[PDB]
Amino acid sequence: AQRVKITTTATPGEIELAFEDTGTGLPVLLVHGFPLDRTMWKAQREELCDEFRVIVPDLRGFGESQVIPGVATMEAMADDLAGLCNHLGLTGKIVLGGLSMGGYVAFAFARKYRDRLAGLILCDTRARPDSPEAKENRRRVAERVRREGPGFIAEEMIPRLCCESTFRNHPEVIEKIRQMILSAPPEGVAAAALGMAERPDSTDLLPALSCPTLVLVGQFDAISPPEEMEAMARTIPQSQFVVIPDAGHLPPMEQPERVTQAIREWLRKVHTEAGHHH
Ligand SMILES: [Cl-]
Numbered sequence: 001a002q003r004v005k006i007t008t009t010a011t012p013g014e015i016e017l018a019f020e021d022t023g024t025g026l027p028v029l030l031v032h033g034f035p036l037d038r039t040m041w042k043a044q045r046e047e048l049c050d051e052f053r054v055i056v057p058d059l060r061g062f063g064e065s066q067v068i069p070g071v072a073t074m075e076a077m078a079d080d081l082a083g084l085c086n087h088l089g090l091t092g093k094i095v096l097g098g099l100s101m102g103g104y105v106a107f108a109f110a111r112k113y114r115d116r117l118a119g120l121i122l123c124d125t126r127a128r129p130d131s132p133e134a135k136e137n138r139r140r141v142a143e144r145v146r147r148e149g150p151g152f153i154a155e156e157m158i159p160r161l162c163c164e165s166t167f168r169n170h171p172e173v174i175e176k177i178r179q180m181i182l183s184a185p186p187e188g189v190a191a192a193a194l195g196m197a198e199r200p201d202s203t204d205l206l207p208a209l210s211c212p213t214l215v216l217v218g219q220f221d222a223i224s225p226p227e228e229m230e231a232m233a234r235t236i237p238q239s240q241f242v243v244i245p246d247a248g249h250l251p252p253m254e255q256p257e258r259v260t261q262a263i264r265e266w267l268r269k270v271h272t273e274a275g276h277h278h
């Protein structure tokens with residue numbers, strides 16, 4: 001892995017990001033969910049790097065990246081991604097993928113950096129903003145995690161993050177996810193919770209998208225259910241919708257091979273070298 005100070009248009013202007021960068025050629029950036037880290041995309045990074053250059057950062061406040069206290073807006077996280085791509089000399093187009101909060105970041109990136117997208121991968125996410133109660137629950141989480149740490153978040157979220165088959169067949173996956181949550185920096189968790197609460201409604205952004213989009217959801221996702229994600233996909237032009245069987249909210253971890261294959265086959269169609277040159 002790498003750790004670099006990048007220049008970002010968001011406050012505070014410079015931030016240290018930890019990231020993986022594996023493979024050569026056409027760039028695919030994968031953005032983790034809340035309150036996880038870059039390791040949730042490990043299988044896809046390790047497999048897709050035979051064909052693509054896969055960049056997987058820890059977002060501000062997560063994993064090994066710098067923690068910026070206050071509010072970490074989705075826009076700021078997108079600005080950081082643009083700054084990372086700038087640092088790396090990836091100033092043309094990328095494919096940007098995100099899961100859950102990472103999807104929110106992807107929408108913020110599409111708003112501001114549309115000409116930098118060859119494609120979007122939206123996993124287990126939604127375009128609507130938080131409802132008022134959901135916003136308040138963000139704030140409650142933020143205020144508590146600063147003091148108590150994320151154990152209470154793991155307790156609440158783990159049963160909702162993965163399907164029954166994952167608990168049975170892959171207890172090691174459950175434990176990896178649990179350790180991601182338990183290790184998440186408290187002030188980073190708080191800042192991102194507050195940022196999610198104030199994110200805009202991206203519903204109307206979707207019909208205005210101008211790149212191919214893959215929408216992926218676990219069959220048993222309890223947080224962003226497949227029915228809702230299918231409806232979201234029907235608002236996005238040039239979309240492909242895939243349900244991953246026997247996965248909940250975290251298909252990349254729960255059904256890694258199925259996710260890798262879905263992404264690989266779509267990338268082959270959408271993210272070509274001639275498209276990069278011209
Ligand atoms: Cl957003």
Ligand SMILES: [Cl-]
Nearest residue numbers: 129130131134
């Ligand atoms: Cl909500």
